[PDB]
Every structure is written in C-alpha cells, then in structure tokens.
Design a protein around this ligand. Structure first.
Ligand code: HEM
Ligand SMILES: N=C(N)c1ccncc1
Length: 289
C-alpha cells in the first residue's frame, strides 16, 4: 500500500508559514484552556495519535489520510479529549481550506512544539485526504498500564527503536492527564518543552498509588505523576541509560526528539525524489510577531 506525497496545488513554504503563524497566534490567544496550560500539549498529543495508528507491516493508518476526521477514529476511546484539539484547528482549516487534514493535524503538532520553546521540527507537506473506508480500526494506540516490554514491542510496529521511544516519551513534559479522559489523575503540569520529564523520573521520590479510577500510577510528594509506561523507562536498564543521557544533555534530547517526531509524522509516506525539501518554520518570536 503506497501513499505518495502530493503538494497542495501551487503552494510553497510561505503558504505553510502562514498556516503555522495562524496556529501559533491562536495558541497565544486561547491561553486559558485547561487551567492556563493552553492548547499546546493537546495539539502535540493529537499529532501523535493521528500518526500512531500506523502499522509498518501493511502501511495502514498513519498521518497521510487525515482519517481522524471520521467518526470511527474521532470516537476511539484512546482519543478521548483530542476533540478539543480538533475544535481548536477548525477555524484554522476554514481560513486555509486548501491544506489537507493530515497536513493540518501534523503541522499543529510541529507548531505547538516550537511555540512551546521546543526544538525545530522539519516538516514536509503533501498528505492527501483519503476516504472514510481507509480509517483504521480502534485499538492501535498504546495502553498506559503496561511495562517496558510492552512499550518496546508496541513501538516496533511504528519502526521505533529504544532511543526513539525514550525521546518521544519526553513529550510527557507537556500538559497532563485528565481522569475523565484516560483514567489517570493529573499531576504538576507545564507548557514549556524541556527535558524535565527525564529529570523528574530520576530525581523525584515516586510512590505507587491508586487513583480514583482504581488505576495505579506513580506520584511524588512534590505533586508530579508518571504513568506506569512512563516509569517503565527507569525500570528497564536499556531505557534507563537513555533517560540518564537526556536528563544530562538538553541539546541531545532536542535533536533526538526532533528526528523521532518528524519520523513519526512521516511514517507511511513516500516522498517523490523531486518533492520540496522539508520546511523549517520560524517561530512567532523569531518573526517579531
Ligand atoms: C507508551 C506510549 C504512550 C502512552 C501509554 C501515553 C499515554 C498518555 C495518556 C494516558 C495521556 C493522558 C491523556 C488525558 O488523560 O488527557 C497522555 C497525554 C499526553 N501524551 Fe502520551 N502516551 C504515550 C506516548 C506519547 C508520545 C509518543 C507523545 C508525543 C511525542 C505523547 C504526547 C502526549 C502529550 C503532549 C500529552 C498531554 C496532553 C494534554 O495535556 O492534554 N504521548 N499520554
Ligand atoms: N508523566 C506525566 N506527567 C504526563 C504528562 C502528560 N501526559 C502524560 C503523562
């Protein structure tokens, strides 16, 4: 199954920078969402969920087709809460109806990471909306109540290795869980992209507790939390080495995250030899906007 990237007709870097800027200005404007976290973290989660349905074995799922817009995927229990990100992006899509759904959802993630002071994430256009019957079934996204072996095996389906996995999970520096979405009680939350997830793992005094949904999670007296799958990164000796690496080298984490996140967003997509090079968007701050 082959999905060839096809650039939205006549569009170039400047067009996509305008879309980035619109997303970024709305991120700045709608600052009260989720107890003043803003929509940054949920847009990153959205980009990950629309991409994380991919299966390397048959090239089903993935970001290309924009299939999150269809009821089956929209209503996946694993996607509970992402409706907020979708609604956030609706007026952006109305202003720029020429952008494909997959391009918009993925660009939303890139914009959010960068605007939250994360690394630059090169981004490529050309995802094309596919029909409703191409929507992957529910159940392709990972469970949080599992161990390191589960995480490792799960991510093999997305063609991600140990480093890639550990880097990607660093996104859990952003935002929080919500008991009503996922059955996990949210802890201390930030909207700035840093390597603090790894520092938290290594430095806090974690206690295994049960939350009000009767699920186990790791909580600190400082008020932080970790999912069981988060904590598995320090239970497994291979993951632990990498956690320590990123806790001790901000720049290395940023570079590795950028590569892994672009890869995640591009899984399943064949880029023609004469496709445009990846775009690196300027932040609002860099533009003086
Ligand atoms: C084993 C893999 C993963 C599991 C089990 C997992 C699980 C979860 C859960 C349960 C939540 C809470 C959702 C809610 O209650 O609203 C969450 C939130 C989040 N996830 Fe993950 N996740 C995983 C990997 C990732 C990856 C790879 C990324 C991106 C690179 C990511 C980005 C985020 C972000 C940014 C949030 C915060 C959303 C918000 O604040 O609304 N996650 N994750
Ligand atoms: N470990 C966390 N604090 C976390 C943050 C956001 N999403 C999931 C987990």
């Amino acid at each position: 199954l082959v999905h060839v990237a096809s650039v939205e007709k006549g569009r170039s870097y400047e067009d996509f920078q305008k879309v980035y800027n619109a997303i970024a200005l709305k991120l700045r404007e709608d600052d009260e969402y989720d107890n003043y976290i803003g929509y940054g973290p949920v847009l990153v989660r959205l980009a990950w969920h629309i991409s994380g349905t991919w299966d390397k074995h048959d090239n089903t799922g993935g970001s290309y087709g924009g299939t999150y817009r269809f009821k089956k995927e929209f209503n996946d229990p694993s996607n509970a809460g992402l409706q907020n990100g979708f609604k956030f992006l609706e007026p952006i899509h109305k202003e720029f109806p020429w952008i494909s759904s997959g391009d918009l959802f993925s660009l939303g993630g890139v914009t959010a990471v960068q605007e939250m002071q994360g690394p630059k994430i090169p981004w490529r256009c050309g995802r094309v909306d596919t029909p409703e019957d191409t929507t992957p079934d529910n159940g392709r996204l990972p469970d949080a109540d599992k161990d390191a072996g589960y995480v490792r095996t799960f991510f093999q389906r997305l063609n991600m290795n140990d480093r890639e996995v550990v880097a990607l999970m660093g996104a859990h520096a952003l935002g929080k869980t919500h008991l009503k979405n996922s059955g996990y009680e949210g802890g201390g939350a930030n909207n700035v992209f840093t390597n603090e997830f790894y520092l938290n793992l290594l430095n806090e005094d974690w206690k295994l507790e049960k939350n009000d949904a009767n699920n186990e999670q790791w909580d600190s007296k400082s008020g932080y939390m970790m999912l069981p799958t988060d904590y598995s990164l320090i239970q497994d000796p291979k993951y632990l080495s990498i956690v320590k690496e990123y806790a001790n080298d901000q720049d290395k984490f940023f570079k590795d995250f950028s590569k892994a996140f672009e890869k995640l967003l591009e899984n399943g997509i064949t880029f023609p030899k004469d496709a445009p090079s990846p775009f690196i968007f300027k932040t609002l701050e860099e533009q003086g906007l």
